[PDB]
């Protein structure tokens, strides 16, 4: 059996979120370097 998932609200959000995250890598840890350059007297 299956519990009739498509008319629900927790499952719709978790479904959309899991699919979007599984599409492509989304972690951007190297873009934060701009946060170490806000003070430069050049």
């Amino acid at each position: 059996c299956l519990p009739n998932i498509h008319t629900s609200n927790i499952l719709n959000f978790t479904k959309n979120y899991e699919i979007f995250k599984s599409a492509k890598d989304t972690s951007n840890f190297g873009k934060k370097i701009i946060l170490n350059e806000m003070q430069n007297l050049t």
Binding site: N36, Q39, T42
Partner: protein, 390 residues
């Protein structure tokens, strides 16, 4: 100030006794150095390319002359010729370093900021110094001038109380720190103690002292010295061996550090200049005007050092360019006359700095020789031991 209201006779006998020319009277409290920036004519702040290129080219010419000579006669010359070429190269580089100090405070060529940043970095690297860290330490010095327990980026004196504490911890005057202080502030090596300053930069090579938003800028600052000491100090050695190192790099380096140390030490230290703690009477304007000593040199030396001795003017008008420092002083000497102190670089001054003014005691608020002070506080150690009878 230490010598308060008293006639001109005792002032002048103190003056010629210590080697100063004009001692200072007493400045009112509750002021700020930035006040007297209104006493300056507005034409003093103007930019001109003539003095700029002259200031960047004269010391370069002196350096090139010294190097051409030294290489023309590499190692066939006796030691005195080597000493003289080293002295010339050291002085030329002290001039270029004054230019770099100007670019660090953003007052050499403000129209092109990228160019002046690059120039300051380049001229500071050969002394193995960092430009951003230098800016920071100098600003911290200007904010805390003569403040006891806080002016760590200047010639903080060795006080009597901390010496007594170290002697109580050492259990005698024979420990390691004892002999270290003994030779560092009793022998002429004091005129090189600026090298200690050099090691206290690189604040442990520790990025945890700074504000995070500046990491990339600080790191870059440390990479210009290192690159030098990683790409150029090899070449020199590889092309001249130990001797070709000690005569081409180490001797000019020691001369430059002589200049740095003597300039600063004479600038902010004298028997009539007190070091008040914070909350206990420390005043900003009083310490920046009355607590400064101006050294006078021969005009050839001055033009070689880019007027590096004139420090008082650029503490009241921090944007005042380098070539307007002599003239500006003449202005202030007219209005702040009775309060300023002045001296001429002579042998007597340095002998007094080495042999007489060694320990600072705050009760008498003056400088006293190290040996008499330590034997006095040791006799009081014996007397408190007698007081420790029961």
């Amino acid at each position: 100030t230490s010598l308060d209201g008293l006639p001109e006779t005792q002032k002048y006998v103190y003056a010629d006794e210590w080697g100063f020319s004009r001692v200072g009277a007493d400045f009112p409290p509750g002021s700020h150095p930035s006040l007297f920036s209104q006493l300056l004519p507005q034409a003093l702040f103007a930019f001109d390319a003539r003095a700029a290129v002259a200031a960047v080219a004269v010391p370069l010419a002196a350096m090139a002359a010294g190097y051409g000579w030294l290489w023309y006669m590499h190692s066939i010359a006796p030691v005195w010729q080597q000493a003289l070429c080293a002295a010339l190269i050291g002085t030329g580089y002290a001039g270029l370093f004054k230019v770099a100090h100007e670019c660090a405070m953003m007052r050499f060529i403000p129209q092109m900021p990228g160019l002046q940043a690059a120039l300051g970095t380049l001229l500071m690297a050969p002394a193995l110094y960092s430009l951003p860290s230098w800016r920071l330490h100098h600003l911290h010095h200007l904010l805390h001038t003569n403040m006891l327990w806080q002016d760590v980026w200047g010639w903080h004196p060795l006080t009597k109380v901390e010496l007594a504490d170290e002697m109580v911890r050492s259990g005698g005057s024979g420990g390691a720190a004892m002999a270290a202080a003994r030779l560092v502030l009793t022998t002429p090596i004091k005129l090189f103690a600026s090298v200690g300053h050099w090691l206290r930069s690189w604040d442990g090579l520790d990025l945890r002292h700074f504000h995070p938003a500046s990491y990339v800028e600080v790191l870059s600052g440390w990479a210009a010295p290192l690159a030098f000491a990683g790409l150029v100090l090899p070449a020199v050695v590889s092309a001249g061996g130990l001797s070709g190192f000690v005569s081409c790099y180490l001797a000019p380096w020691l001369v430059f550090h002589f200049w740095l140390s003597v300039l600063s030490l004479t600038a902010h230290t004298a028997p009539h200049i007190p070091w008040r703690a914070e909350g206990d009477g420390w005043d900003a304007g009083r310490a920046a005007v009355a607590g400064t000593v101006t050294l006078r040199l021969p005009r050839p030396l001055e033009v070689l050092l880019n007027n590096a001795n004139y420090m008082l003017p650029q503490a009241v008008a921090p944007g005042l360019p380098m070539w307007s420092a002599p003239a500006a002083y003449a202005v202030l000497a007219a209005r702040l006359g009775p309060y300023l102190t002045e001296a001429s670089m002579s042998l007597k001054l340095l002998t007094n700095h080495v042999t007489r003014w060694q320990i600072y005691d705050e009760e008498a608020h003056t400088y006293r020789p190290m040996e008499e002070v330590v034997d006095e506080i040791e006799a009081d150690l014996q007397q408190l031991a007698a007081a420790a009878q029961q």
